[PDB]
Amino acid sequence: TLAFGDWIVHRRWYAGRSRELVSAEPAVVTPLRDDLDHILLDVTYTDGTVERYQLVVRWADSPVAGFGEAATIGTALGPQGERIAYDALFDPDAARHLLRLVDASATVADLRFTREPGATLPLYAPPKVSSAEQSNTSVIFGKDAMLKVFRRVTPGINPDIELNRVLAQAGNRHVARLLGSFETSWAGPGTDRCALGMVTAFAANSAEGWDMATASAREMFADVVGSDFADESYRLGNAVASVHATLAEALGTSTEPFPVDTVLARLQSAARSAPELAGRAAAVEERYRRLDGRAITVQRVHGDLHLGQVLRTPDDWLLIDFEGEPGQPLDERRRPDSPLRDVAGVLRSFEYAAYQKLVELAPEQDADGRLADRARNWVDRNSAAFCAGYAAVAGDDPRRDGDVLAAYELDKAVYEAAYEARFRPSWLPIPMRSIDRILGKLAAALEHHHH
Ligand SMILES: [Mg+2]
Numbered sequence: 001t002l003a004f005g006d007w008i009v010h011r012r013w014y015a016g017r018s019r020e021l022v023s024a025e026p027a028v029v030t031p032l033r034d035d036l037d038h039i040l041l042d043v044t045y046t047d048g049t050v051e052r053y054q055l056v057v058r059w060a061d062s063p064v065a066g067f068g069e070a071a072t073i074g075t076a077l078g079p080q081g082e083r084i085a086y087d088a089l090f091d092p093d094a095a096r097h098l099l100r101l102v103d104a105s106a107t108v109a110d111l112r113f114t115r116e117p118g119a120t121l122p123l124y125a126p127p128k129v130s131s132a133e134q135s136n137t138s139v140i141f142g143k144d145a146m147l148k149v150f151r152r153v154t155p156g157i158n159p160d161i162e163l164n165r166v167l168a169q170a171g172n173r174h175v176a177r178l179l180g181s182f183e184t185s186w187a188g189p190g191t192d193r194c195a196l197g198m199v200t201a202f203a204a205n206s207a208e209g210w211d212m213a214t215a216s217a218r219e220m221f222a223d224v225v226g227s228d229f230a231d232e233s234y235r236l237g238n239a240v241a242s243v244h245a246t247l248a249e250a251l252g253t254s255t256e257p258f259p260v261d262t263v264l265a266r267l268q269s270a271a272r273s274a275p276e277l278a279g280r281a282a283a284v285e286e287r288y289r290r291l292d293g294r295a296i297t298v299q300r301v302h303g304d305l306h307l308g309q310v311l312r313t314p315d316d317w318l319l320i321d322f323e324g325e326p327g328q329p330l331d332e333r334r335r336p337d338s339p340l341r342d343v344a345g346v347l348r349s350f351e352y353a354a355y356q357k358l359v360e361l362a363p364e365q366d367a368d369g370r371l372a373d374r375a376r377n378w379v380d381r382n383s384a385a386f387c388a389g390y391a392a393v394a395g396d397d398p399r400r401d402g403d404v405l406a407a408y409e410l411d412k413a414v415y416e417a418a419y420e421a422r423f424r425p426s427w428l429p430i431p432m433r434s435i436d437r438i439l440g441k442l443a444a445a446l447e448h449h450h451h
Pocket of ligand 1: 308320
């Protein structure tokens with residue numbers, strides 16, 4: 001008996017939003033130790049919806065100073081007297097215990113832990129909770145591994161674990177390698193699987209693609225675009241194509257019609273958020289409908305790819321976070337899609353990395369548009385480098401099917417414009433400029449005028 005409800009509403013990973021909870025009760029309690037319980041917690045709302053959260057509880061007979069406020073769940077009477085319940089993920093000892101269960105591929109009641117074959121886990125390293133993790137909780141062990149424990153849990157195959165396992169077991173070097181994972185059932189033994197967490201190799205001394213890109217795009221008096229970041233963009237193209245190739249081989253390819261009705265529905269929705277889109281909607285729709293009946297090759301893909309999802313280690317680019325298109329239901333997130341849509345995601349990301357500078361300047365600071373010109377030249381150079389690097393591995397330039405590529409770029413820009421109109425009005429000119437540019441790029445490709 002803990003006041004779970006009173007505690008959970010204050011957590012940044014809690015997704016109850018503005019809603020009234022009816023109850024918050026443990027569906028399953030699994031003892032891991034005398035002073036350690038694993039809890040599946042069901043939160044029920046007034047509409048009858050239930051959301052399940054994973055909690056690990058460390059009990060103490062006396063307050064431990066090491067724990068903060070958000071780690072303090074509540075209190076309860078136990079068999080030896082009063083006890084305090086803490087969030088065990090903030091306990092180094094408890095986190096280590098979980099890692100040890102993974103290492104041993106332990107089974108505890110309906111909890112199944114598995115270590116990836118041949119993997120080594122850093123059981124000796126100091127565990128430190130990551131402040132960077134927002135929606136889940138990540139514990140970093142020294143510089144060797146990261147334990148990610150899912151907060152909200154849902155039934156079915158987890159694509160992040162799934163695709164990382166495929167890539168690691170195939171020996172693809174462009175991932176932060178999956179070392180282990182754990183899961184349980186949704187409604188007791190014999191029912192749907194429920195992913196609970198994952199352990200991955202930690203890429204020490206790494207840089208985020210977004211940070212490297214923006215640093216390059218901000219270099220002062222860089223009117224002649226540099227080859228050093230073009231070199232990196234090429235290598236990133238190599239990496240994305242290699243990941244796609246491994247996924248295609250393992251999980252197959254198929255053909256589908258280009259999804260005209262899906263992207264039209266997204267356009268219609270977007271135009272309601274951003275009135276500025278109405279003036280472009282007819283032209284966008286024209287381009288989409290020209291792809292009606294166009295067969296496209298699809299496969300398993302990353303699904304949410306941009307420069308924030310790639311890490312540069314001293315040796316390689318890695319892709320991380322394969323959970324899929326955010327806001328989409330699971331079955332949708334495991335659907336195959338065009339590799340060109342992933343490529344489009346990176347191209348959108350280059351555009352933002354370069355043009356973020358401009359929206360943050362006063363008009364007087366670029367009156368003649370020469371900084372805007374440089375941004376354009378920078379995006380062009382690094383986009384070309386990325387596609388060339390992709391091509392070197394894929395043996396097919398993603399620009400060859402230019403109409404399909406440009407359509408996916410357009411759909412992302414339309415979606416971006418609706419986001420900026422609502423949440424960041426001063427950023428809206430970035431996707432609006434892209435839309436006018438891409439409409440021409442797409443128009444040209446449809447006529448086979450692209451190189
Ligand atoms: Mg991410």
